[PDB]
């Protein structure tokens, strides 16, 4: 059993799979606490399968790609959310109402020319 979902946020793609077992993540073939830096946002990263209560059910073992640590995280909780709707397909409203299953809504904004960087206009003296 391999329920393989994908997930994107902030220029960082994250594809997951779901092998049965218990809750244990193997992001880039290594431990999460030695890969994700400070362990705070991991309990916010466990929010999507919290509402389906499949804690001791699924090992995931993500292969992540690109971005940063808050771009790799917040993309595997969106990663397994596309995979949780092929594990519990009737539980789509439990994830739609609370968070995870929305999107990659927003990335960095374009630097316009004639300007310092990304909508921050430069200082002028004489008003």
């Amino acid at each position: 059993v391999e329920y393989r979902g994908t997930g994107r946020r902030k220029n960082s793609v994250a594809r997951v799979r779901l092998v049965p077992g218990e809750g244990n993540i193997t992001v880039n073939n290594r431990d999460v606490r030695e890969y994700l830096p400070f362990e705070s946002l991991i309990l916010d990263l466990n929010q999507p399968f919290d509402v389906t209560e499949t804690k001791g059910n699924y090992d995931v073992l993500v292969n992540v790609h690109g971005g940063g640590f808050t771009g790799q995280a917040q993309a595997i909780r969106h990663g397994i959310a596309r995979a949780l709707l092929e594990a519990d397909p009737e539980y789509r409203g439990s994830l739609k109402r609370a968070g995870l299953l929305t999107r990659d809504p927003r990335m960095k904004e374009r630097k316009k020319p004639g300007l310092k960087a990304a909508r921050r206009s430069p200082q002028f003296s004489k008003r």
Binding site: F38, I42, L43, D44, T70
Partner: protein
């Protein structure tokens, strides 16, 4: 759009340790220059000294300390010209939450010790014991807005 109407205020994510929204909002205000981890580690080492110098867990102590910080009257200036132009106005509940967090951090940065390991926790136990520096400017607002009470 602050003249089409009001801006839609957005949701935050509560802390994992204390399971509190109020802790994460304290993380974001002590987050100087976008550094999330290097400021969150300091708060996670600025309530252990709280729980060392008092037996109670700090999630009780935090919401007990900020109640000696959060004022109930403030001053909004109305352009009346030659009048006092300082109307004592009560505080909305959203600004009631925020402005206590502001005074708690802005006077934690002006103590004798250098580490915010114990710059923060000293002012919390002062605010837990209704004393210190962030408490005494609430009384300064309660000696300013409560002195010009002719504009209720």
């Amino acid at each position: 759009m602050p003249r089409k109407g009001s801006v839609p205020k957005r949701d935050v994510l509560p802390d994992p340790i204390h399971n509190s929204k109020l802790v994460t909002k304290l993380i974001n205000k002590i987050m100087l220059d976008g550094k999330r981890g290097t400021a969150q580690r300091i708060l996670y080492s600025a309530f252990d000294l709280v729980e060392q110098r008092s037996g109670r867990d700090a999630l009780e102590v935090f919401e007990e300390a900020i109640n000696n910080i959060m004022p109930v009257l403030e001053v909004k200036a109305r352009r009346v010209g030659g009048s006092n132009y300082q109307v004592p106005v009560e505080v909305r509940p959203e600004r009631r939450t925020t402005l206590g967090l502001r005074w708690l951090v802005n006077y934690a940065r002006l103590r004798g010790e250098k580490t915010m390991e114990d710059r923060l926790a000293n002012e919390i136990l002062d605010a837990a014991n209704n004393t210190g520096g962030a408490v005494k400017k609430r009384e300064d607002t309660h000696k300013m807005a409560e002195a010009n009470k002719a504009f209720a």
